[PDB]
Amino acid sequence: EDSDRKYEEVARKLVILEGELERSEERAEVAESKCGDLEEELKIVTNNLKSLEAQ
Amino acid sequence: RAQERLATALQKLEEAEKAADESERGMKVIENRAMKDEEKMELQEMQLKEAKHIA
């Protein structure tokens, strides 16, 4: 019974650990999407400010 | 005195063989119990074995 409930407990720990490491990559990749679009709009606004710097 | 010691012989053998036969039913029940303990040992050492297996 010792080995039994021990493996059962640690298997539940593993299943929850998976239930979180799954969306680990999810909230990782949304961050990167944010980085990308933010750098994009950074470039856009840096071009626009310079174009308006004329006079 | 022949028949006197005769009666002594009778009662003696009678009680002695009643004792023999109660020891005989005792051996019946103890051989039963012995096979019982044997199969007990078998199956319980065996559940120990599968306990070690799954352990």
Coordinates of C-alpha atoms in Angstrom, one line a residue, chain A residues 1 7-8 11 15-17 24-25 29 33 35 41-43 46-47 49 55:
Chain A
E1 CA 0.0 0.0 0.0
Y7 CA 3.0 6.3 -6.9
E8 CA -0.6 7.4 -7.0
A11 CA 1.2 10.5 -10.5
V15 CA -0.7 15.1 -14.1
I16 CA -1.1 18.6 -12.6
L17 CA 2.6 19.4 -13.5
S24 CA 3.7 27.1 -20.0
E25 CA 4.7 27.3 -23.7
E29 CA 4.7 32.2 -27.0
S33 CA 3.9 37.6 -30.3
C35 CA 7.5 41.3 -28.6
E41 CA 4.9 49.3 -34.3
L42 CA 8.1 50.7 -32.8
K43 CA 9.6 50.8 -36.3
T46 CA 10.0 55.8 -35.6
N47 CA 9.5 56.2 -39.3
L49 CA 8.2 60.7 -36.3
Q55 CA 10.8 71.6 -40.9

